[PDB]
Each structure stands twice: as C-alpha cells, then as structure tokens.
Design a protein around this ligand. Structure first.
Ligand SMILES: [Co+2]
Ligand SMILES: [Co+2]
Ligand code: NA
Length: 264
C-alpha cells in the first residue's frame, strides 16, 4: 500500500532531495556545445560518489548502464549517456538524477537549453515546467490524485502539446518506485486521496507533437513516434498538513519550497 513517512523519514528525504538538486545545480556550467553526454554522466557520477559520498540509484537499476539519464531533443526519457553523443547549439536536454543517501531516495530532473534556442524548444520547456508547477500548487491533503492528472493534461493540451501516457511519477522513499502511480492525465481508474506524510514524484513528459513513443534497439531510449521534441521536469515532494514541501527545490526554481493552502 502507500507508505506514510515519519518525521524522521522526512528529514532523511530532505537530505536525499537536496543532494539530488545539487547535482543539477552543479552540472549546469558544463552543459554546452561540444560536450559529450558521456562526459556529463562521468562528472555527475564523481560528484555524487566523491563529493557527496552518496550513491546513484540508476546505475544497475533493472540493468540501467549509466549513472544519470540524459535525454536530448526527440528523446522522451532514458537517454543513455555516451561519449559519441555531442551537445550542439539549440539542443534541449533533460538530465534526470536519482541519489540514495542513508537508504532514502531523491529523484529530480530538469531541462537545459544548449546555446541558442529555437522558439518551439524554449516554449516547450516553459509550458512543461509550468505544467509541473501547476500540479505542485494543487497538492494538499484531501485532494484526489486524479484531479492532478486531469489538470496537467487539460493544461498541456490547451497549449497544443501532448502528454506521454506510458510514463508516470511515483511514490518514493526507501524504495525507488513505490505506490502510488502518479498518472499525468485523466483516468477514471485513478482513486487516491492524499494524506500528509505521503512522498512521491511528479514528472510530466510533454511532446510538442503526438503522444506516441517508440523504444529503440537499445531497450532503453525512448523517442517520440513523430520525431517531435519532448521535454520533462520532475520534483520530489512530501504532502504536509496544509500543502506540500518540495524536497528537490533548486536555486533556479521559481516556486517556493513550501506551499500553504490557506483554504484549509
Ligand atoms: Co522518477
Ligand atoms: Co527521475
Ligand atoms: Na528531451
């Protein structure tokens, strides 16, 4: 079932989350034209291991071969870091990180724009981030997860993009992927009432084009069927007594760490 974390668990999650966000703040500078995805994966790994003294949860997860997922342009998710894949001007890149510290996990990701941006690229990252923020703003005890999925979808579609169906956010803590499944669209099957103490991620994958995807020969890389661009953002949060607390907040986030719902 869904696990309610205790205050102490939360404190642990706060540490794992901060570490995860840090990695994202740390790698920004190195994200530029000409750099390979493999080198970025190496930098993150070393940082996590040697500086943070933590562990990457992705490395070996169901056989995942690298430390972080780096998805470029049309890649939807699970892009495999590789030394032959170089960053170019105009690319939109997602870097997804999961760190373990003391047994608790912190999962987060962001988009980066390489060099000069395209109108659509920049626009797609912005609506994708807005769609995550919107969801975050909704979280409070008593709401149903279905309303969140519905809201994201409606928003995204009203802006002319699509939400990927196959991939969802998830409960998280001692376990990388715990209940519940957090769908980013409306589904009559969804029925979970939020309680304080619940910890989970929200990580909408948005396509500028059609919602369909395809998985490559590699068994990991997922791409849009129509070759359109795809973007995603993700945060880890805890449901509080009157709202939520964002455990993976970074300095460039423009949403506050704690969201209090005065209507409560
Ligand atoms: Co996740
Ligand atoms: Co992630
Ligand atoms: Na992408």
């Amino acid at each position: 079932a869904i696990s309610i974390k205790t205050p102490e668990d939360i404190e642990k999650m706060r540490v794992a989350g901060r570490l995860a966000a840090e990695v994202l703040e740390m790698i920004e500078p190195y994200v530029k034209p000409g750099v390979s995805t493999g080198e970025l994966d190496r930098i993150c790994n070393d940082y996590i291991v040697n500086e943070q003294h933590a562990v990457s949860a992705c490395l070996g997860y169901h056989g995942y071969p690298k430390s972080v997922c780096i998805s470029i342009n049309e890649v939807v998710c699970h892009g495999i870091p590789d030394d032959a894949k170089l960053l170019k001007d105009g690319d939109i890149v997602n870097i997804d990180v999961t760190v373990i510290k003391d047994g608790f996990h912190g999962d987060t990701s962001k988009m980066f724009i390489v060099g000069k941006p395209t109108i659509m690229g920049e626009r797609l990252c912005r609506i994708t981030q807005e769609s995550l923020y919107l969801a975050l703003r909704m979280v409070k005890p008593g709401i149903n997860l279905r309303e969140i999925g519905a809201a994201i979808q409606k928003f995204v579609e009203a802006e002319g993009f699509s939400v990927v169906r196959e991939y969802c956010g998830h409960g998280i803590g001692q376990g990388f992927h715990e209940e519940p499944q957090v769908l980013h669209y409306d589904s009559r099957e969804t029925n979970v009432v939020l309680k304080p103490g619940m910890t989970f991620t929200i990580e909408p994958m948005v396509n500028a084009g059609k919602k369909e995807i395809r998985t490559m020969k590699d068994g990991w890389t997922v791409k849009t069927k129509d070759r359109s661009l795809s973007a995603q953002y993700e945060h880890t949060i805890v449901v509080t007594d009157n709202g939520c607390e964002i455990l993976t907040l970074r300095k460039d986030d423009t949403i506050p760490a704690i969201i209090s719902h005065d209507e409560l």
